[PDB]
Amino acid sequence: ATLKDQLIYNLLKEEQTPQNKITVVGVGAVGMACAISILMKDLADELALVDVIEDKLKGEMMDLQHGSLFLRTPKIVSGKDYNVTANSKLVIITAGASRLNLVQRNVNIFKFIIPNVVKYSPNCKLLIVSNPVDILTYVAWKISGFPKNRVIGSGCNLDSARFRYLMGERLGVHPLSCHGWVLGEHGDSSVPVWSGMNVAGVSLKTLHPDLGTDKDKEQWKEVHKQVVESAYEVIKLKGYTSWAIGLSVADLAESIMKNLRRVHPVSTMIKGLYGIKDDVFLSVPCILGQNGISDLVKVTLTSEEEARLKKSADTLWGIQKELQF
Amino acid sequence: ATLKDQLIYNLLKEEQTPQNKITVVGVGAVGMACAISILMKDLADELALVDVIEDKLKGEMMDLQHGSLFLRTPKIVSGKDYNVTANSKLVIITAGARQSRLNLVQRNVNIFKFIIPNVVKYSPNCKLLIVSNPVDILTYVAWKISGFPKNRVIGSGCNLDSARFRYLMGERLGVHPLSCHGWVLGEHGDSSVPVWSGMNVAGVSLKTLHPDLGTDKDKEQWKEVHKQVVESAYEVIKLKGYTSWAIGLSVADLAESIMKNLRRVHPVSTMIKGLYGIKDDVFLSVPCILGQNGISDLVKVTLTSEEEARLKKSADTLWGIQKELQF
Amino acid sequence: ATLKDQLIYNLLKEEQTPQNKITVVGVGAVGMACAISILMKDLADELALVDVIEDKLKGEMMDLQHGSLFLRTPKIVSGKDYNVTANSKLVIITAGALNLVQRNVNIFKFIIPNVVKYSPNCKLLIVSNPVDILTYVAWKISGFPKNRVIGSGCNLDSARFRYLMGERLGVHPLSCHGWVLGEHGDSSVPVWSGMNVAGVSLKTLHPDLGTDKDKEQWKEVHKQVVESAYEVIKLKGYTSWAIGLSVADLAESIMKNLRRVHPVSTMIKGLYGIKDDVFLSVPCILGQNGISDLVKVTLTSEEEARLKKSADTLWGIQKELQF
Amino acid sequence: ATLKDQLIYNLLKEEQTPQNKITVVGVGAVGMACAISILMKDLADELALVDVIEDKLKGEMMDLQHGSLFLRTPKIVSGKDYNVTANSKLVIITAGARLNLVQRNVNIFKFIIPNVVKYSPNCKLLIVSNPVDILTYVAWKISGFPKNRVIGSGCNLDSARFRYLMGERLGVHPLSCHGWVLGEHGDSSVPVWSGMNVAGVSLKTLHPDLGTDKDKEQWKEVHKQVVESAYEVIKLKGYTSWAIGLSVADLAESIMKNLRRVHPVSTMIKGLYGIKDDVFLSVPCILGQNGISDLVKVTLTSEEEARLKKSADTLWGIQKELQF
Ligand SMILES: NC(=O)c1ccc[n+]([C@@H]2O[C@H](COP(=O)([O-])OP(=O)(O)OC[C@H]3O[C@@H](n4cnc5c(N)ncnc54)[C@H](O)[C@@H]3O)[C@@H](O)[C@H]2O)c1
Ligand SMILES: NC(=O)c1ccc[n+]([C@@H]2O[C@H](COP(=O)([O-])OP(=O)(O)OC[C@H]3O[C@@H](n4cnc5c(N)ncnc54)[C@H](O)[C@@H]3O)[C@@H](O)[C@H]2O)c1
Ligand SMILES: NC(=O)c1ccc[n+]([C@@H]2O[C@H](COP(=O)([O-])OP(=O)(O)OC[C@H]3O[C@@H](n4cnc5c(N)ncnc54)[C@H](O)[C@@H]3O)[C@@H](O)[C@H]2O)c1
Ligand SMILES: NC(=O)c1ccc[n+]([C@@H]2O[C@H](COP(=O)([O-])OP(=O)(O)OC[C@H]3O[C@@H](n4cnc5c(N)ncnc54)[C@H](O)[C@@H]3O)[C@@H](O)[C@H]2O)c1
Ligand SMILES: O=C1O[C@@](c2ccccc2)(c2ccccc2O)CC(O)=C1Sc1ccccc1Cl
Ligand SMILES: O=C1O[C@@](c2ccccc2)(c2ccccc2O)CC(O)=C1Sc1ccccc1Cl
Ligand SMILES: O=C1O[C@@](c2ccccc2)(c2ccccc2O)CC(O)=C1Sc1ccccc1Cl
User: Fold this and answer.
1) For testing the chain D interface, which of C46, C245, C260 should be mutated: the one with the most D CBs within 10 Å?
2) Which residues carry this modification: Phosphoserine (chain B)?
3) Which of B316, C149, C269, D162 would give a disulfide with C139, using CB separation of 3.0 to 4.6 Å?
């Protein structure tokens, strides 16, 4: 009799499949920020990390494990082999590297990652964070063979969060109570939907018809410009962004894992909307839950706003048709 | 009229002061992990960040602000000037480049000579939580420089050591670390002392069940659990370069007890003069009751002759270094 | 020496004045639901309970205290005497019985000066019905500036509305936005123009929204907000859980200085052609100083007229009250 | 096309089943305290309520539903028919009256338990209804479940009360005051003095008279207060609810999140302490997604073993006469 056998009488050895498992692929700054935020929100009963850099992977794993006393996630695993990811409800991909090469190089990474993920978690939802996110969501969708509902791109979720932060600073109101949607292509070409911006259901555009135009005395257009300038500025200042993307991703994870059916601006296949007929992924408000994107909101856009999304779809398809699978 | 004034009618513009403000000094890997953990536990109404590297400081500030939608800490500020830290309840020092030990002391004392008086100037009534290494020496140093009473100068101490210990114990037993109790005390790091007599699950003493526990005669080598606390630490540095997540979680747990006045007991570093035959002004980890006045009480653990000798030895070495420090 | 002194060496005995204290007055179904909700949200470092029924009060305190292991609120106290409430940041009034209003006024004549004596700088949050009138009564008796006297108002009404909207749309209520303003309860006003998902206006899509001639009868969503409350009283005898949760949401914003916007009852003279000292719900920014700002909702003529009629009705009652 | 269709484009209508459903049976003071505590802890994606009083059930359901904006449990259902409870991970039984006390809750359980097993054959059963140790045996007998999936709330609350009182005496948070009350829930529970400690410092070693009549500080009265304060609370407010609700939600947390934390709950103790009868008593158990996977073999003094054994004989004496 060992000490363990002297202290503890076992009733059954029958270990079960983990029921609420999340995997993060890529343990760089983004991936780890996603990991810590997911752990502090108690979303998973098992977390798996994967990367190609083996020492860094083990170290990050152990560092999380050593905080186990302060968490409610009883099993943290990692490995280069995707067997550690088996039976994940949700797999978050943050792995990634002129700049048309860059796309094909991340496609090449995805050619390896995606089939391994699918092999071990055929029923998972895929959440793509890697950039350029809209293209890479299409790539994951294409390589995986999943229905469109199970391939979600982070998209404009962070863009909108920044927008609401900035709006909140201008109005002196918590971002939670400042509503506004940045849609379309993540990053420099995103579209701020001025018609939807509100506090307490009071449309800013109705109060201030010049809102978001060049005639706007207060230049609210700057808020959206600042959304892009902020991201360049953070990179210039600290070298990367981590905390904000980690938090926005944990929020998406919460909706999926808990089947909340909250509405988030994420990247989904928008074929058949806004005059678009190519297989491209762009952000619109989506209902997120246990089967992923079940529904999307049909935002009423101005002709200018539809045109901007159309141009994005055309540019995105232009790149995609040239990619090698 | 501006859009804001059309939308919003102001009842008053009295600018008041934060009620539950926390400052983190040094926004490296440790400091920023501390920050995210504190933010995700809703412990503060204002978070202030200080560092000497101005671009890194701003970028970190901005990156947290951008996650505001997902948090309930409405104000995050930063700056090189300590005026951003005014009226903090709790100030956490994680400053100084990560790591000989005497040369580490030397450079972190010099940093503290600048940091601590600026913290005291703006937050005279704060609790100071020292994380920077060597943590026991630097807790003494903060207490000497600040002039604060003993209760308000807390060193992270063996809080992480004990958490690592409990993780490892839980792994061998198949029990959650929360339900595996055991205390690593004394000097943080290489010379810490595992108190075998206190190790238990459900009040069942492991040492009583297994008298060889922690001795060289133990066939299950439970002494390796404490050795693995030490080895774990070196291994994480080898693998990723630094520790961040575990220390950040451990610090947020201490902040929780202090901000919410919980009077929970934690292994942290406090002025141990008067215990264990120790007559010098040294800080070492014992179990301390933490609350809104910091360390209000400490637990008097019965130690074996050997365990007591190790604390005494640490106290002798630490006082040997400290007596030569120039203030 | 005692076991305590053998185990524990004390560094200092000194006790601070409470830093994040909440008081709930009235330990009925509403008061206790507010209490449990506040406790499970870790909003207070000290909770005080006050009621006139001493056995009930003691029993409720002990039951909560016996749950201390599972909570992070280390001091829970109670008493008939308001000395237990000293230095509260937030005092929540849920105690209660033209007859009924005056009976609650009489209760408030005892309660409010006692609250003020022991927490002169607190925010008051009034839950007791009829809430809009009794928030006015607390304001008058206390002598507090209007920013520190807040009525639970239409926070619950709006939460119900968002629950019903969410059910109809297949969307979580958090993403279903819509505001019920004005007088709490029967005479509340659903603001159809603000009802939206993701910034998409339902009224703009569906102009019949909120009219009697609406084929989908979306007006019934607001009627069911009123019908819901009567049904719950019919079926179980009182409402508690929803109101408790709604009050804790308000407390969170105040105690954490969030500056979120909530539909709560505030002194509305100077808006919407209202010229009397009446409290009605509009969207208000809530924080450490209570209500610092309000949102000026653009109302239709019919919406405005409903608020004005409530104002006249409330004031018609209030002018008759003896203090 | 409705407004819903005008607003929302549906990608798929593939309907789903909950992944983390919990059922509470009985919506009285205890049941609803369990429910609100479970809801505020985000343990379930679906909560089902069952009771025989139809208006009360509907009204309590509605009341919780109305606070949905402030919760993260997207569906609350209720019903008289146990089809509303299908595929529950965890079913908490709090129904029954607050020799006669036992046989009447037994009769309730003859209806309830088969109905639960029918719709959720793989669930963990958590029994709260009193007398909890007896009704846990009854649930186990009727269900045919393996013993790991039938758990009584047992002495989780007694130990929580003990730790509260200990904490008040020492000036330490109950979380940091360790002490186990085992055996029978209620009058005959056993305080394990040898395990009582702060920071692993044994109070019995520091204070040898701890738990004896010779004790000048009368620590034995702390355990007496645990036994009593329940009667005290019933006398003052009519029932207990909040503490039990909090304790049940703590157990539910460990089950639903597979935490493998140790709690004192009622389990089959035949084979321990010389006990031979099919009796349930509280010992410390490791709780996770398979219910009680393991138990801690506390080392008891001869007096302590004698006390548990006496309880086992008493309970069996009642149980042998019950008719199923
Ligand atoms: N959508 C958004 O809003 C959002 C915001 C920030 C970052 N991103 C993206 O996240 C990605 C990563 O960001 P980062 O800062 O952590 O970069 P990083 O370089 O620090 O980390 C990337 C990690 O991916 C790993 N990796 C590379 N190939 C891999 C493979 N085949 N399998 C497993 N792991 C592999 C790398 O080793 C590295 O650890 C980038 O594409 C970045 O653009 C997008
Ligand atoms: N006690 C424990 O259990 C525990 C565990 C891990 C780390 N630590 C310690 O925490 C400290 C920090 O670790 P790290 O990895 O974050 O180091 P780091 O180098 O990543 O960061 C240090 C930060 O301190 C800043 N800094 C330097 N001088 C400063 C000054 N005068 N004022 C303000 N800020 C200043 C640096 O610019 C830098 O941003 C180290 O001493 C490390 O050993 C202790
Ligand atoms: N504003 C809202 O949305 C909301 C919703 C529900 C209830 N309410 C109101 O909450 C109030 C109470 O609801 P309830 O169901 O808990 O009623 P209750 O009758 O169950 O409990 C009321 C408590 O008030 C206490 N009380 C009476 N006089 C007192 C005094 N002078 N000092 C201290 N306490 C005193 C009683 O003793 C009792 O415990 C009612 O006015 C009710 O209408 C409003
Ligand atoms: N284990 C503990 O530590 C602990 C603490 C408190 C109470 N309890 C017990 O919990 C039980 C309930 O306490 P309470 O205060 O909630 O009682 P209660 O009277 O308020 O509620 C009991 C509910 O059970 C319902 N019920 C009765 N028969 C039913 C059936 N066949 N099917 C479904 N529901 C049925 C009743 O309608 C009622 O709603 C009692 O046995 C009490 O002793 C145990
Ligand atoms: O903030 C971000 O950081 C990155 C970026 C990309 C392109 C331009 C600026 C920043 C980045 C660059 C290099 C290394 C790490 C990074 O995370 C990646 C990225 O998508 C964002 S978010 C963003 C970016 C541009 C505009 C608006 C928004 Cl909301
Ligand atoms: O884990 C830690 O990391 C550091 C360390 C110090 C000395 C020996 C090993 C590690 C470290 C070194 C370099 C860079 C960054 C670091 O955080 C600092 C530190 O105190 C710890 S904790 C620890 C250390 C040694 C033994 C047992 C424990 Cl629990
Ligand atoms: O839901 C409520 O319950 C009470 C009520 C008051 C007046 C009419 C119906 C119900 C009630 C009655 C009796 C006993 C206890 C109670 O809480 C009190 C009350 O304000 C509400 S909220 C409400 C009430 C009416 C319409 C719409 C709404 Cl949103």
Assistant:
1) C245
2) 305
3) C149
* Nearest residue on chain B to A230, alpha-carbon basis: B62
Residue D30, annotated ligand binder?
Answer: yes
Nearest-atom number in ligand 7 for the CA of C154 is 29
Structural method: X-ray
Atom 18, ligand 4: residue with shortest CA distance: D28
- Separation of alpha carbons A273 and A110, rounded Å: 27
Query: What kind and span of H or E run contains C115?
Result: helix C99-118
Per-residue DSSP letter, C140: H
Which residues lie below 8 Å from residue B309, measured CB to CB, with a gap of 6+?
A: none
Q: CA–CA separation, B124 vs C236, rounded Å?
A: 54
Distance CA D250, CA D227 (A): 21
* Residue labelled with tokens 């699918």: A118
**Does D123 count as an annotated binding residue?**
no
Where does B233-272 show beta strands of DSSP type E?
A: 264-271
Contact criterion met (CB < 8 Å) for D290 and A6: no
Whether residue D203 lies within 8 A of chain C, CB to CB, comes out as yes
What interhelical angle do C301-318 and C131-142 show, nearest 10? 50
CA distance C171 to chain D (A): 9
Q: How far out from the chain centre does Cα A217 lie?
A: 35
**Resolution for the entry shown, Å:** 2.0
Instruction: Say if the Cβ atoms of D192 and B203 lie within 8 Å.
Output: yes
Identify whether the C-beta of residue B73 lies closer than 8 Å to the C-beta of residue B39: yes
Q: Is D185 a catalytic residue?
A: yes
Name chain C contacts of A300, Cβ cutoff 8 Å: 200, 204-205
- For chain B, the residue count is 327
Residue D214, by phi and psi: left (phi above 0), alpha (psi -120 to 50) or beta?
alpha
Catalytic residue annotation of C: 184
Domains and CATH numbers, chain C: 14-153 (3.40.50.720), 154-321 (3.90.110.10)
Pairing of strands B283-291, B264-271: antiparallel
Nearest Cα residue to C263 out of C162, C129, C170: C162
Dihedrals phi, psi of B25, to nearest 5 degrees? -95, 115
